[PDB]
Amino acid sequence: MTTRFKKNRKKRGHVSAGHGRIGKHRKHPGGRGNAGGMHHHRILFDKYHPGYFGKVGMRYFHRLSNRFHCPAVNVERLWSMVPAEAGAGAGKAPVIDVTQFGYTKVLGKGMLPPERPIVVKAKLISKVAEKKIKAAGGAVLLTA
């Protein structure tokens, strides 16, 4: 028996929260702020997945350093790295490579298990305090 305003399930997903209960979230408001001004993206994207293709990754160009020991800016190898302040990379599963990732922030200590030459340098822009008093200098390489 039905009249589809009983078993159909009432009309609206309230009374399951309203006086009945189960599921979802309960005890609601936490912090609030930020608005549409202070907004999107702090990225975390792992270094281990690029570290897989570090060895064959002379498509992000090596130069003075060896074929195996490869300069790669990881910023322009990671898609959608762009709108966020910094991407720092985690090391999950072992890496057995002599890769070199340049980052805007690093999970450094991360560098220590692939200490077999890695090049972990800071990003001038990571500081913030660099004098663009017209002048010239630091930024980060990029692509979409």
Binding site: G23, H49, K55, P94
Partner: protein, 163 residues
């Protein structure tokens, strides 16, 4: 008649060659297993038949990691029977060889496994050279793990006091 007697009539029925088996290659392959199993002594090939019957939405992808880790000199390079597919999200250069047979391989896997050693064997060959089904492990593959046991929906499935 009985309620006891009705109990026998209401029994199991897991049983199914899958509701729709679209893949003709899957369908002929299970026929090959069906023919050999009743003409051989092999418990193992009978297990394969069930795993290729009921669902494909249950067959688990298996990474190169953990495949390598249980053949660690305690299985001397046997044949790994992989129900679903090999996937390639690791680099160690794995074991220096291994004969891996599966239902399906990824295109990356076909290149990667054979250039580490052994040979990517098809399940057609597995049936051919081992209807006896010996010197063989059904290697592994999980879906029961951290993500997606009852961990579904939006916000999972909980520690457990209330849900």
């Amino acid at each position: 008649m009985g309620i006891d007697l009705v109990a026998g009539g209401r029994n199991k029925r897991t049983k199914r060659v899958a509701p729709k088996s679209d893949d003709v290659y899957l369908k002929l392959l299970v026929k090959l297993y069906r023919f050999l199993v009743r003409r051989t002594k092999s418990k193992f090939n009978a297990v394969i038949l069930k795993r290729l019957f009921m669902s494909k939405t249950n067959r688990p992808p298996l990474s190169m990691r953990r495949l390598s880790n249980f053949m660690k000199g305690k299985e001397e390079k046997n044949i790994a029977v992989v129900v679903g597919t090999i996937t390639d999200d690791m680099r160690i250069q794995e074991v220096p060889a291994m004969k891996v047979t599966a239902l399906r391989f990824t295109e990356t896997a076909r290149a990667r496994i054979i250039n580490a050693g052994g040979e990517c064997l098809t399940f057609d060959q597995l049936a051919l050279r081992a209807p006896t089904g010996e010197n063989t492990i059904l290697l592994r593959g999980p879906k029961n793990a951290r993500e997606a046991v009852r961990h579904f929906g939006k916000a999972p499935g909980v520690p457990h006091s209330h849900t």
